Symmetry: D2
Subunit: 329 residues, 4 copies
Amino acid sequence: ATLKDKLIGHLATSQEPRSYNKITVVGVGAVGMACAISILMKDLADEVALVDVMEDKLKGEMMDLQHGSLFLHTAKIVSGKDYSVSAGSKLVVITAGARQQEGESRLNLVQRNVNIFKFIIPNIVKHSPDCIILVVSNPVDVLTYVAWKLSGLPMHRIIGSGCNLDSARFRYLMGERLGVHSCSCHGWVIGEHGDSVPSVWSGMNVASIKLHPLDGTNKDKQDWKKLHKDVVDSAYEVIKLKGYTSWAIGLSVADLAETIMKNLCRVHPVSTMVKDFYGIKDNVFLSLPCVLNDHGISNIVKMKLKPNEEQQLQKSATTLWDIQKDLKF
Amino acid sequence: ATLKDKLIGHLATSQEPRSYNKITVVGVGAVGMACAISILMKDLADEVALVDVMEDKLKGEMMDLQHGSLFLHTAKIVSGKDYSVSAGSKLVVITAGARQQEGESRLNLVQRNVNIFKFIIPNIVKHSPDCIILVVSNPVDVLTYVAWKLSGLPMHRIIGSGCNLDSARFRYLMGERLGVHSCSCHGWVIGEHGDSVPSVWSGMNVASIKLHPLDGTNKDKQDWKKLHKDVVDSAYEVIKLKGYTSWAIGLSVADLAETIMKNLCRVHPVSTMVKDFYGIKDNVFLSLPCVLNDHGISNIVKMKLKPNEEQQLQKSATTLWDIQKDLKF
Amino acid sequence: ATLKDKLIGHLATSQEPRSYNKITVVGVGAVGMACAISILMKDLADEVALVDVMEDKLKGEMMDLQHGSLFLHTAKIVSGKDYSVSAGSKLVVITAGARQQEGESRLNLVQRNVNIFKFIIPNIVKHSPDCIILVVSNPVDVLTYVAWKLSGLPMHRIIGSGCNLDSARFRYLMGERLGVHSCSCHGWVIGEHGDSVPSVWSGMNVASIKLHPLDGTNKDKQDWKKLHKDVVDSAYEVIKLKGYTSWAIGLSVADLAETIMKNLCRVHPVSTMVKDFYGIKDNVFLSLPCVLNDHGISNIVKMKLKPNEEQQLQKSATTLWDIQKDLKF
Amino acid sequence: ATLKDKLIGHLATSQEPRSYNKITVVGVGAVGMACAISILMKDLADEVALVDVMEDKLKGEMMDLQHGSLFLHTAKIVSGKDYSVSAGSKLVVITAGARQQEGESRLNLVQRNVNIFKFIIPNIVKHSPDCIILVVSNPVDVLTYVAWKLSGLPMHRIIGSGCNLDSARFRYLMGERLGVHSCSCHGWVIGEHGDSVPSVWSGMNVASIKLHPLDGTNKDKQDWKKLHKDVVDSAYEVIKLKGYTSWAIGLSVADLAETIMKNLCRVHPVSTMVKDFYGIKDNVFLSLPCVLNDHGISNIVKMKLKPNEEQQLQKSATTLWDIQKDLKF
Ligand SMILES: NC(=O)c1ccc[n+]([C@@H]2O[C@H](COP(=O)([O-])OP(=O)(O)OC[C@H]3O[C@@H](n4cnc5c(N)ncnc54)[C@H](O)[C@@H]3O)[C@@H](O)[C@H]2O)c1
Ligand SMILES: NC(=O)c1ccc[n+]([C@@H]2O[C@H](COP(=O)([O-])OP(=O)(O)OC[C@H]3O[C@@H](n4cnc5c(N)ncnc54)[C@H](O)[C@@H]3O)[C@@H](O)[C@H]2O)c1
Ligand SMILES: NC(=O)c1ccc[n+]([C@@H]2O[C@H](COP(=O)([O-])OP(=O)(O)OC[C@H]3O[C@@H](n4cnc5c(N)ncnc54)[C@H](O)[C@@H]3O)[C@@H](O)[C@H]2O)c1
Ligand SMILES: NC(=O)c1ccc[n+]([C@@H]2O[C@H](COP(=O)([O-])OP(=O)(O)OC[C@H]3O[C@@H](n4cnc5c(N)ncnc54)[C@H](O)[C@@H]3O)[C@@H](O)[C@H]2O)c1
């Protein structure tokens, strides 16, 4: 007799608690919490662990989600600065890092973020030797390359959020113009998560109907190219208006964790090793259409690129090697 | 003082209950309940009304869903043989009708189902003058034509479930072979909901990549045509094994009610008036890619059909006119 | 022939777009977007309208949600400073207003927020004469009183978010201690959304088992009273750590919009007219357990309060009248 | 070069597919598919395996769900008569067995179902040594006892669906009368899943308000006892109208699998070992309020039963021992 002793009986038998679908969101900032509320809301994990160097912020964000437990189906929300909190995660999502000030390219953030990465990746792997690492930080393509190097994980367990967002942005504008739910519109953005992103004009379709063979001049005149245009600009506009981007990437990331936690084998433009494809010579990471499952990237989809697109992918891959080349370890 | 008087107070103010997103599923059979449990589960309507001539069956099915209210977010489930139960529905889904015995074509059901239709459509319209009618009964293409004629509703408020299912079936097999979630696979089935269904080989794609320009011989050799093959066969197999088809169409229908109840403007292969498209001369109904909203079909998507497909659509449209022609009113 | 003309056909028939389940979130701040992302995610409305005086912030938040359309089932997201944007809303959620600086009581915000209210309520009612107004702003109890007065709407269409959050907070701590999902724990917080909130010790239960008759001393010794304690403190902690509260109220609000948009008739502690209950003499608003539907508060639940609780409710109602009394119109 | 070779590339790295949240529904009948469509729809497992002795029926049901993959988030649906198909399930739900003909008590099914059980339990455990077994078959209380004996699994990994349904049925009728969503109504049914079920009159509440102290005579006069009445009758009515019960138990079961697959620790009336509680002397299984997690029953909730209820539980436990006693192994 205590309250709990008087209410709660026990059977002869029982075993230690254990969570089997754990996800760790590293970084409890704008993007941080956006990914975290998305996942919570999609009941993707039975456990969510937040990690951040900022200790007050972490605990308040933790607390704030915990007060909402009644309204969820995620049995455990934990948090701490010590990476021990993240042990046995199936997915580790990284969000730590400086962000773009307005007008600053994502590429300008490489040194700042490499330096954070160099501290975070050892501990991650330390505590979850078999996880899948999902980088979101910018410059996301370069950072997925770093994370892979520093980590030594099989290439397939390292993914960048990459162009999933870009392609989402593209298909929303397509939708806006054709007057069709973005989900019914099919168009792909690959290459860098940034200013040198390639738009696959010859893949664009609504119900398998090629926009290119209907228009022809698509790749160029009628300001259809503006769609690509608004796509590269979009991060910059949102930043100047709002200050940062949060909610689109939370969703874009949750989409990705779903395919993974459900072993769904869906095609998503994310960041991978592009070496040996389309004549690329180096260890460069960029988005291509990838098949994802519960163990990472299952397969890459080989795109039959037109001459100009293929030329665009080449450039993309180039602006990024000139950056990796000079990465000091 | 009564139980309720002692517990439940009242404010000075209040107004009559009223439901604003009502859906009536007419027919409480296999397909009946499949559509009904799908919708319930997607919280699409604030009210669900079932109607059937079979009075014991209706009330038990009603009862059975009602006992599950705690586990739902649909405030009202009602039922009755008198079409008064369905008044002010935003969507009316018809499921009443004989079904295929094994080996029987859907076309063989026309007389049986016309005769039911002739009793059901007047009352429907009677009680919900502004609804959207969704036919599911077979032969679904012919029945959406009947329903339209007998009803006199603006063509856009009359839809057949049509090829939404067929195309779902197609993309599942595509998925099975490429090793990609059916949702990432894009392929379209149009024409009749049946044996003369046209498969658009030149629309087939994964990430905007045309399977046709990669293969070429697609429309013919390598048994890729078998996919189309298994698609026409599928209803017949399921029937001989199981006796009928239920769960695939429930889902296919819910998908459709969603786009409608959410005014989402998504593209779905459903049955419409094909007159004046692809050289079709008559008042024939078949599936084409349609844009749907909260008021019905918003727009048709004009497909750039290849010579053989276009020839297939023509045949389809023909096997069906020879049937409508002879419909006695 | 244009792109769209070549792709998109038309039937003989069609009708004007119109949305039928519209919700307007007034205020695109922390709480603002939390309520807005919750609702979006629960597919509660076919249309979401944001309104704010801050024009850059509004448009960027609008834009940011729009870029996420593919990942939702809400056909329309709109925004503007002119209340015309909100016309024909079924629900209007108000979030505009100063917020607590750390250590500041919610009561200190009355003058600031009355002054905003005096500008916002006329236009709301102007544009949606039949809506349901949901106040969230603080001090929420006083503001639902203002909104009602200035508006002249039937008392039942005016609701405060009130103690739904408080009671959520209570049941999370209960859960934490008994070792039971907060949803399986039943405990109620009523009275002011603030420091004088009454906790109904004699309603507390897990599976209809009264914690009070098991403990007895519950209302006082064993620090069970600390639960109430942490509940009043909670807003203040989160504020000092994080700066404001957002995510718990977004969820708490969505829960409320659900019951409404689904005509579910669920019991929620929200703010109403308490006049004539428990000896209250004045036009005071506080949370009591209310039945909600698609037209507002359907019914109040009469609580059989114990002598001390009833005494607590009285005090609560008193600290709030001393404040309404002096409201200058 | 093959289709797939031309489209699908490979990284240097990759690992064997594996599913980590597997559920096996044994029995592809009415109840069978109801549980299976519920779970599918709640994205509870990354893999669903159906097992049945009836081979045509199994494969067609399998096929029928597979054709609906596009419309789900469950990567794998499998099926087979050989229990090898079920290896490494986290949850095994048993549905195999005769069902009640109208007017037949659940108790009459014991011999028929024991005999099936004796074949099924060895293979289950054979193939998934660490699973959680969920019995649904009738008489469910007796069958969870059998399953435990024959299996030798730690008592906590064996659960009966039990009174979760009964209590759902109770709270729907409560709701019907008070005019409150069944979820806001709290009332508990324990004891046998059948004719001797005990209703806890003294636990009944809406917002922690005791219906008993408001009424007093509750346990007896005013036909409030009819609610209990309709609860025991309900299975029998549905059977005579419809032929069997399916959809309520599918949902009731999914609710249960959720708490389990999400390690939510929620309280559910299910079947357990009641030995040593309320003076029960024997190895009897009946529903009591239990805390469930990812490893089974975590804890029992000790109810403070009134004298008559406690007397009811005793009887219940007795009608069931007289049946177990004589079970021939
Ligand atoms: N790839 C995409 O689509 C995309 C989209 C938007 C934003 N981003 C990027 O996301 C990152 C975060 O953006 P933000 O707006 O949330 O920034 P922000 O100001 O919120 O900073 C994020 C956080 O990272 C933390 N952090 C710093 N060093 C840390 C360390 N050693 N360990 C753990 N956490 C640490 C900070 O304490 C803070 O919580 C930036 O790199 C930004 O460029 C990427
Ligand atoms: N288009 C599709 O994709 C598709 C898929 C499968 C099944 N179907 C069709 O669905 C229809 C029903 O199939 P089923 O398997 O459920 O058949 P079924 O045996 O269950 O018959 C359906 C029901 O319709 C009722 N009905 C008969 N006349 C009625 C009337 N006047 N008013 C109301 N209800 C009445 C019956 O009482 C019964 O409840 C059949 O036409 C079948 O061919 C269509
Ligand atoms: N009741 C609850 O549970 C609860 C919980 C938390 C916060 N709140 C309250 O929510 C309100 C907003 O809190 P916050 O943290 O989001 O504050 P905040 O700083 O974000 O301010 C909210 C916004 O209101 C806008 N606003 C100001 N005047 C306006 C006008 N005339 N028309 C429209 N919008 C106008 C501002 O531009 C800003 O967008 C505060 O009153 C806070 O106390 C209530
Ligand atoms: N506990 C509850 O709440 C509850 C509710 C309703 C129904 N039930 C029970 O569910 C059980 C099934 O009911 P039903 O209506 O679906 O019956 P049913 O006719 O559909 O029979 C179910 C199935 O079990 C299969 N089966 C028989 N022996 C088998 C074996 N050795 N291995 C595997 N499968 C085998 C049959 O082939 C068939 O697929 C019955 O015991 C019924 O009483 C329980």
